Design a protein around this ligand. Sequence first.
Ligand SMILES: O=C(N[C@@H](CO)[C@@H](O)c1ccc([N+](=O)[O-])cc1)C(Cl)Cl
Ligand SMILES: O=C(N[C@@H](CO)[C@@H](O)c1ccc([N+](=O)[O-])cc1)C(Cl)Cl
Lengths: 137, 135
Amino acid sequence: IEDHISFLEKFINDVNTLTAKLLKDLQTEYGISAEQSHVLNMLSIEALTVGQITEKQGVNKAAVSRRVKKLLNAELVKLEKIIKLSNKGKKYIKERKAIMSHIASDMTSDFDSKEIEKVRQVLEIIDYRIQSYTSKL
Amino acid sequence: IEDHISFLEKFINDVNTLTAKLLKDLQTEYGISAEQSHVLNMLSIEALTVGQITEKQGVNKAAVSRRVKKLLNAELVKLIIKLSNKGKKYIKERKAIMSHIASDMTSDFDSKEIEKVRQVLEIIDYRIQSYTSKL
Ligand SMILES: O=C(N[C@@H](CO)[C@@H](O)c1ccc([N+](=O)[O-])cc1)C(Cl)Cl
Ligand SMILES: O=C(N[C@@H](CO)[C@@H](O)c1ccc([N+](=O)[O-])cc1)C(Cl)Cl
C-alpha cells in the first residue's frame, strides 16, 4: 500500500543488479561504463538533450557531460541539434536486447500471455500517469 | 517478448525519472545528491559494510568510497554503516512524498488488479534473485 513502493524499489534494485552483471563483458568490449550504457539505453528510446538526460537522471550535470562527450568520442551517439544514437551505438543496444531476451525467456517460460496482458495494461496506465506528473515541474 | 522488455525498461526509466524530480528539492534541502539517497535508501532496509553496499550498485571503488563518509559528516549515517537518527527521519520524509503520489495515482484501482500486478512482479523478482545468485 506504501509497501508496494518498497517492493517496487527492491524489484528495481534487483533488475539493475542483474542487468549490470549480465552486461559487464559487453560494456568492457565496448569501453563503456555502466552509467554510460544506461545513457545509451536512455537514448535507445529516441533522442535527448544533455539537460534532459541530467534532469531525467538526477546526477551531477558535470558527470552527465563527462559521459556524453565520451560517447561522441567513441562514436556511440551522434547529433541531430540534439543527441541521437549512432549505428555503432545501435548494434550495442541490439547486442543488449539479445542478452536480455535470452534470460527473460527462462524466467517467463511458464507464463500466461493473457495473465501478462492485463498486468501490462495496468502498467501502461500507470506509466501514462507517471509521465504526466513528470512534465509538470 | 522484446516489446515486453522494452516497456519494463521504459516503465522503470520513468519511475526513476519521477522519483528524482519528486525528491530533488528534499535532497537538496538535506544537502545530499540522489546517489547519496539510495545509499540511505538501501540502509532504510539494513545496514551494510562497503562490500555489499557495492554488491547491489556494482559501480566503481571510488564512487562508493567517496559518498559513504560524506553522509556521516552530514550526520545521517553511522559506522558496518547503519542509519543515524537524522538519516532515519529523512527516509520518513522521503516515504511520505512517494506514498501520497503513488496512492493518489493508483487510487482508482481495484486492489485485485494491483495485487495480481504485484504477484507477477514477485514471481519475476523471485526468479531474478535466484538467477542473479546463480551469478
Ligand atoms: O568533465 C570533466 N572532466 C573532463 C575534462 O578533463 C573530461 O576530460 C574527463 C574525462 C574523463 C575523466 N575521467 O575521470 O574518467 C575525467 C574528466 C569532470 Cl568529471 Cl572533471
Ligand atoms: O543506477 C541507478 N541510477 C539512477 C537512478 O535514477 C541515478 O539517478 C541514481 C544513481 C544512484 C542513486 N543513489 O540513490 O544510489 C540515485 C540515483 C539506480 Cl539508483 Cl536506478
